[PDB]
Amino acid sequence: GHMQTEEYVLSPLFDLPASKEDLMQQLQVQKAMLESTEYVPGSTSMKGIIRVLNISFEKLVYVRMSLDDWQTHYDILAEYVPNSCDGETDQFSFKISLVPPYQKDGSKVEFCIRYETSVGTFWSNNNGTNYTLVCQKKE
């Protein structure tokens, strides 16, 4: 959680696991959350890694985005990173649509994770500042 790198990174205005403590404290509520966002070098997309808390083998990690008020959602079924789960938490990744190095006007994209498990559907949804990314590079 919290990939800080001096390179092309998206400008986020939401909550991300800053420390393992902060991670755990939020992960008891909203079990499925994003770790960080990374651009794809040479590809018109961005990839994010979502960390979910293994509470159910039958787990679903759906990434839904909207640049809209949420009248629409692409539903991306995230791809589980093989063997990432070490008993407690799993890691999934997904690719998103185009980003800043290709279109940097503040395109917008708010995504949320729908974690459907045997023990409930955990929505990773926040104060509005969900996974709100403003399509612009760091520097």
From Swiss-Prot:
It is found in: Membrane. Residues 26-134 form the CBM21 domain. It comes from the Eukaryota. Skeletal muscle, diaphragm and cardiac muscle. The CBM21 domain is known to be involved in the localization to glycogen and is characteristic of some regulatory subunit of phosphatase complexes. Seems to act as a glycogen-targeting subunit for PP1. PP1 is essential for cell division, and participates in the regulation of glycogen metabolism, muscle contractility and protein synthesis. Plays an important role in glycogen synthesis but is not essential for insulin activation of glycogen synthase. Interacts with PPP1CC catalytic subunit of PP1, and associates with glycogen. This is Protein phosphatase 1 regulatory subunit 3A.
